[PDB]
Design a protein around this ligand. Structure first.
Ligand SMILES: *[C@@H]1O[C@H](CO)[C@@H](O[C@@H]2O[C@H](CO)[C@@H](O[C@@H]3O[C@H](CO[C@H]4O[C@H](CO[C@H]5O[C@H](CO)[C@@H](O)[C@H](O)[C@@H]5O[C@H]5O[C@H](CO)[C@@H](O)[C@H](O)[C@@H]5O)[C@@H](O)[C@H](O[C@H]5O[C@H](CO)[C@@H](O)[C@H](O)[C@@H]5O[C@H]5O[C@H](CO)[C@@H](O)[C@H](O)[C@@H]5O)[C@@H]4O)[C@@H](O)[C@H](O[C@H]4O[C@H](CO)[C@@H](O)[C@H](O)[C@@H]4O[C@H]4O[C@H](CO)[C@@H](O)[C@H](O)[C@@H]4O[C@H]4O[C@H](CO)[C@@H](O)[C@H](O[C@H]5O[C@H](CO)[C@@H](O)[C@H](O)[C@H]5O)[C@@H]4O)[C@@H]3O)[C@H](O)[C@H]2NC(C)=O)[C@H](O)[C@H]1NC(C)=O
Ligand SMILES: *[C@@H]1O[C@H](CO)[C@@H](O[C@@H]2O[C@H](CO)[C@@H](O[C@@H]3O[C@H](CO[C@H]4O[C@H](CO[C@H]5O[C@H](CO)[C@@H](O)[C@H](O)[C@@H]5O[C@H]5O[C@H](CO)[C@@H](O)[C@H](O)[C@@H]5O)[C@@H](O)[C@H](O[C@H]5O[C@H](CO)[C@@H](O)[C@H](O)[C@@H]5O[C@H]5O[C@H](CO)[C@@H](O)[C@H](O)[C@@H]5O)[C@@H]4O)[C@@H](O)[C@H](O[C@H]4O[C@H](CO)[C@@H](O)[C@H](O)[C@@H]4O[C@H]4O[C@H](CO)[C@@H](O)[C@H](O)[C@@H]4O[C@H]4O[C@H](CO)[C@@H](O)[C@H](O[C@H]5O[C@H](CO)[C@@H](O)[C@H](O)[C@H]5O)[C@@H]4O)[C@@H]3O)[C@H](O)[C@H]2NC(C)=O)[C@H](O)[C@H]1NC(C)=O
Ligand SMILES: *[C@@H]1O[C@H](CO)[C@@H](O[C@@H]2O[C@H](CO)[C@@H](O)[C@H](O)[C@H]2NC(C)=O)[C@H](O)[C@H]1NC(C)=O
Lengths: 674, 674
């Protein structure tokens, strides 16, 4: 298994090394590094001519002269002041006329501003600026290790750095601390191996997977809710569509993990009753432990009355719009069948900039999601604008760790899916592919297993004045057994009459509902996980297609550590996926953990005529190369019919799991010491 | 300290004497008085030609022939039938062609109608009729002493009257009954000296202050929610602005009293959870005690299910309008920034006539304030249209005695202040006064203390057939120590470039929040109490202004008993404030009770260019002589800026309290007997 690579020129390489020079030892400043001198004395005012937008720069300066979030404090985009500052900073980065002015602005920020705040605006700018297109971003877990690993292993790294090494390596092994080469390796367990407060803990290997969490972070920085989608041209008109697709797909995938663990559907809650599923983040900031929400949390308390009424009102509005058939307000009146209605509900639920026709949201345009994250996070109200007790719900990099995150968005998609039943359902004729028929589909054995995975966590530690004189160590390694599966083929048999360009899609869906009974397309159309999308020229007669799971376009390879990125740069290359598909879900997670006896699911292949791609979303996500609605044909209900189309095939499938069932078993000292 | 007086001609004096002739021994009828014969035989039908609006008079007769509230029963403008009768009566009074016809109509009413009802319509007619403009109104506590004093002292007066004097004066002293001259003086404690059911009771000297309660009553009769603001020209368009101003100032002032008493912010509540703070009115009607709301009252019971859904719906509508950026309904469509928006939210929350574009409100036009006062009052449903158990929330003269009164309006203004954040914030430029700078502000020591205050409470008692044959006694006096403060100067130091006409305002704001930390303008702009407003001619160079607290235009002098009014009329004079500023907050209450060590607050002086006064509200309140929104520049949030404007100055201040801290200490027999 070789990783696909891509060729880059000398300019790109030079810009790549520059951006990476600002992603090192992020919680500390190195006066020996070139960036410190540049950044410390950069005069934004004096170079105001090197920015395409003078107003944005002046607003930044005006804001900056008043002070920004101090260093070391936690930064969260869900807090007004912090967000506005971060956004002003983003504008300073985005409007730099050229890479050089941008780099200097970045260095300025790195030296003067809050590390978290800088990293946030930095990450987004690299994604948004045209001149940095293709630039490979370092893994978020490598940049925010304190957000991707529990305190028990963070504390072990702290103890190692404080002791300046291992004092008794033979004893350290019993605490998962091993030395390999010149690296210190830390075997890190998911939380279900240290605390089991509720049954949802059984899903910890999935909800705490660094790749899954990185995936949500990438989703957000690819296109922040506070920013307009203008830059992406077409996506703007299809933004709400993308919202639905992303969350439906994520919720459905999470649902599958629940199913193979016997946890049933995503729980429903009320803002007027205790929230059943609590959550205890084993994370910490530099000033406080993350807030905890005990099981059966009394959410309807005096501190949340007003917020709950707002959330209620927000839901009420939508439900009433569905009833009367029209969305009023926001400067327009949309009937449910309007051609922009789909984008409206999506933008409405997310309360994004595009809902208002602006480039950035304002503080007074209150958000359902932000307020809901606030009350579900269970944190006491902020001490002040710059100080708050964070919860898993305050970061896109830790959101998926909280069971209520899925419950919140499942509630939202719940309404979105209700809205979809008011639309014209897909007719049997529009779904039919005259001349095309799928005679059979055979799927190879589906097997999951846990496999060790390492990543650089050195950013967890603080370097010595002497250590800063020499090259960075990239000394610490965090090792966790992560979910994965064996590659598998899908053999498709297609009997055709005429020759035509066809599109073939591969989905994965449940076979039974939570109670073990047969699924129903009428109520379960939204439970199909899109796995593949590709064009294929169908020749008259017999057509045999073989798609290997490693080829599914929906997923990407694991990221490589910054150190391997450099070696690859010497060759004038960059990982293909890491550069162009950084937002895709890691392929090692395309399958939910199976069971020893094999858990029931079904694959489905659908092939339809290839045609218009005039309003595709390639500038956003590469695989979106058609005009059909995202998730087609499971994007909305379908005109109930008891006789399936010949161009769609459903194949039963079983997901088995090999090796140790529980991930923590691979971190038992007796085991890894062999 | 001399009280300001105003000269009045003979015509005014005779009308003043005529109006006061109907404010004597109000719960009884005097056949020996001139008004009795006049009112008993007055024929409205026959004199219909003396009313400018015949339809109104016919409606009154049609309604009167069916019967009105009987004598002795409690009257409240919050009960449908009662309000409708009162409004009909008002029209009869208002449409009288000349003073004489008005007086007869009033005499007729005094004789035939419910005393409370008559007094209600009468008070308002005197304020609204043009020919009675300036006519001095007797203090509400003199007219309705049973609404301004607890039953313990009401019963003492009853006992005195029944015994026809004191049987054992030496002994009566131990109960606060003392004879002075020809008066019987009753030392009257606030409820916190007889029952301490919850911590809010420590605010009783304030919430029960007769002046504070009279103030709210004056606010009502000056312009009832059921009547249109048409009479006041410009006010009509700014009605909502005045609504926000009145309640925000009152709520802020209340907040200040909580701060010096360690009671923090105004509590928030939910219609679906027990209301924490109860209230026990130590008041009674002629037929029943006032209803009581115990602590942690179960408000969400079957009797209130439907009313709560209404209240909840009313709030939902506002919250959704804010979210969609437009107010729909009531015959129009108003975007948040529309020029008519501010008045809409005001008229909406109040459910007043101007909301519907009518003269007076109708029964089916359900009111949030009324329904909320109904469920918060905790009284069982009315026996019938004429019989109900009253709560402190059923009267404008007792409302401030109930903690939930503040909680309810704080909830409404919460929404109002939320709406304010959707408006164009005051820009730094517009707040800047070019060439004008406030160099310094010095405030003399702020000191509060309790000082005895007496008022005529003879209306509490019933007179003898013989006593009615001679002049009214004005025999009984209620004595209570009331909050007060020493006069203080505010020295303002201004450095100007050129000469201009400037407006200088003075505010009092908190220094710290309820937790003891620094206030923030972005979140506490609504907590600034306006204290003074005046024009001043600034000359080039150094300017020095000296304003004494006694000169603040926002406050008035205490009311004089009706007996002192007569003596003053004989000199062709009337108190200046009682005549033109009756609705102003008593100046003795401008400062919250301080603490021995001195409680922190801050004074702010802001000076801006004097200009337009085209849409001023002088006809309503004298001090509103500008075009600026009421409360400027703290009427809405301001473009956040850490750099203060040169024409504004903040000065730390400490409010000290001298003498006994608790008011009841002055009502201890050992103390007042010396
Ligand atoms: C415990 O607990 C407690 C309780 O809580 C606490 O306390 C706290 O604390 C805190 C901290 O400390 C604090 O805070 C702070 O404060 C401070 C002070 O303040 C003040 O002052 C200021 C200044 O002033 C000045 O300036 C101005 C301008 O700007 C002007 O105007 C004036 O006049 C003056 O002048 C001057 O200046 C200068 C000096 O400085 C010179 O030039 C000369 O001298 C001149 O003359 C100011 O600004 C302020 O203001 C304020 O206030 C007032 C009143 O008072 C007012 O009026 C105003 O307006 C303002 O206010 C307000 O506003 C609003 C309200 O409405 C809001 O917003 C707020 O409140 C505000 O405030 C005063 O006066 C200060 O300084 C600081 O600052 C800082 O921080 C912040 C945040 O926090 C930011 O924003 C800013 O920016 C800054 O930053 C900085 O720092 C930090 C740390 O801290 C960091 O992180 C950052 O990064 C930065 O850094 C920088 O700086 C530093 C110093 O500063 C240094 O060191 C550094 O360096 C380094 O690094 C670099 C790189 O980067 C390198 O290169 C090198 O090498 C190294 O070295 C840098 O440079 C703050 O703010 C508070 O306050 C307290 N609280 C209380 C209640 O008290 C404690 O802490 C604890 N403790 C423990 C142990 O834990
Ligand atoms: C206990 O508990 C119990 C239970 O709760 C109770 O009971 C109650 O009681 C009550 C009280 O008493 C009652 O009520 C009452 O009643 C009565 C009776 O009724 C009946 O009758 C009437 C009358 O009739 C007549 O008239 C007419 C017209 O108008 C006609 O039509 C007829 O026919 C007749 O005629 C005749 O007679 C006359 C006389 O009157 C002559 O002219 C000749 O003879 C002729 O022929 C009537 O109206 C009524 O009716 C009604 O009802 C029916 C049924 O039955 C019906 O059908 C009808 O429609 C009617 O209505 C109804 O209905 C509706 C609808 O549904 C409703 O709303 C209701 O139901 C109604 O009702 C009958 O029949 C009566 O009378 C009375 O009245 C009164 O009151 C009221 C209120 O309440 C008012 O509004 C009115 O106006 C009146 O008033 C008066 O009185 C009062 C007192 O009470 C007062 O306050 C006032 O102010 C007034 O006064 C006046 O008068 C009097 C007499 O009455 C006198 O006395 C006085 O005198 C004074 O004056 C001056 C001062 O200002 C001086 O100057 C001198 O000097 C002095 O003296 C005055 O004048 C009532 O209503 C009830 O009923 C019961 N309930 C039950 C259930 O039963 C008890 O009470 C208790 N007890 C204890 C002790 O606590
Ligand atoms: C009054 O409201 C309108 C719309 O609600 C505001 O107009 C918007 O202004 C922003 C600029 O910040 C534009 O990006 C939008 O396209 C405008 N939308 C519409 C519908 O006009 C207007 O700014 C508000 N009034 C003021 C003075 O700001």
């Amino acid at each position: 298994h070789v990783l696909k690579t891509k060729d880059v020129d000398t300019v790109f390489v030079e810009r790549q090394k520059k951006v990476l020079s600002l992603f090192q030892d992020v919680d500390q400043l190195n006066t020996n590094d070139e960036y410190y001198k540049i950044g410390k004395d950069y005069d934004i005012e004096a170079n105001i001519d090197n920015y395409t937008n003078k107003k944005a720069v002046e607003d930044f300066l005006k804001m900056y002269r008043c002070g920004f979030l101090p260093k070391y404090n936690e930064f969260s985009v869900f807090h007004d002041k912090l967000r506005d500052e971060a956004i002003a900073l983003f504008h300073l980065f985005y409007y730099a006329k050229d890479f050089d002015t941008f780099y200097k602005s970045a260095a300025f920020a790195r030296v003067h501003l809050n590390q978290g705040q800088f990293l946030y605006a930095y990450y987004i700018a690299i994604i948004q600026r045209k001149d940095t297109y293709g630039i490979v971003l370092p893994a978020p877990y490598e940049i925010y290790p304190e957000l991707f690993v529990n305190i028990d292993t963070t504390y072990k790294m702290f103890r190692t750095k404080m002791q300046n090494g291992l004092i008794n390596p033979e004893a350290a092994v019993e605490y998962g601390i091993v030395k390999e080469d010149n690296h210190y390796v830390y075997y890190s367990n998911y939380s279900n191996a240290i605390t089991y407060y509720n049954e949802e803990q059984r899903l910890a290997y999935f909800t705490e997977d660094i790749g899954l969490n990185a995936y949500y972070f990438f989703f957000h920085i690819h296109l922040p809710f506070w920013w307009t989608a203008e830059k992406y041209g077409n996506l703007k008109e299809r933004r709400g569509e993308m919202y639905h697709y992303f969350y439906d797909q994520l919720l459905t995938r999470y649902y599958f993990e629940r199913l193979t663990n016997g946890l049933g559907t995503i729980p429903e809650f009320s803002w007027y009753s205790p929230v059943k599923t609590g959550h205890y983040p084993l994370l910490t900031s530099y000033y406080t432990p993350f807030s905890q929400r005990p099981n059966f949390y009394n959410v309807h308390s005096e501190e949340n009355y007003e917020k709950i009424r707002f959330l209620d009102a927000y839901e009420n509005y939508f439900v009433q719009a569905l009833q009367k058939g029209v969305f009023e307000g926001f400067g327009q009146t949309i009937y449910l069948n309007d051609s922009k209605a789909n984008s409206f509900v999506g933008n409405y639920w997310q309360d994004n900039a595009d809902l208002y026709g602006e480039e950035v949201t304002k503080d007074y345009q209150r958000s359902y999601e932000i307020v809901a994250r606030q009350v579900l996070g269970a944190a006491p109200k902020p001490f002040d604008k710059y100080t708050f007790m964070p919860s898993a719900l305050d970061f896109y990099q830790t959101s998926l760790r909280d069971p209520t995150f899925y419950q919140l968005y499942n509630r939202i998609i719940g309404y979105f899916n209700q809205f979809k039943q008011y639309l014209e359902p897909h007719s049997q004729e529009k779904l039919h592919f005259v001349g095309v028929k799928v005679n059979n589909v055979v799927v190879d054995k589906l097997v999951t297993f846990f496999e060790y995975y390492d990543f650089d966590a050195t950013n967890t530690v603080f370097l010595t004045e002497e250590e800063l004189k020499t090259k960075y160590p990239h000394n610490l390694k965090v090792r966790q057994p992560r979910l994965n599966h064996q590659p598998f083929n899908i053999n498709i048999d297609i009997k055709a009459d005429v020759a035509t360009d066809a599109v073939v899609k591969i989905f994965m869906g449940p076979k039974y509902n939570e109670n073990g009974f047969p699924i129903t397309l009428e109520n379960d159309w939204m439970k199909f996980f899109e796995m593949d999308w590709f064009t294929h020229k169908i020749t008259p007669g017999q057509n045999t297609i073989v798609r290997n799971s490693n080829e599914f376009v929906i997923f990407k390879e694991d990221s490589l550590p910054s150190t391997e990125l450099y070696k690859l740069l010497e060759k004038g290359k960059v990982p293909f996926d890491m550069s162009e598909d950084f937002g895709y879900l890691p392929k090692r997670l395309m399958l939910p953990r199976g069971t020893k006896g094999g858990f029931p699911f079904q694959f489905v292949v659908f092939v339809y005529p290839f045609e218009s791609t005039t309003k595709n979303l390639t500038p956003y996500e590469k695989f979106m190369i058609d005009n059909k609605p995202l998730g087609y044909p499971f994007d909305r209900p379908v005109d109930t019919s008891c006789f399936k189309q010949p161009n769609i095939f459903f194949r039963d499938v079983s997901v088995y799991h090999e090796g140790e069932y529980h991930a923590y078993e691979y971190n038992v000292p007796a085991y890894f010491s062999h």
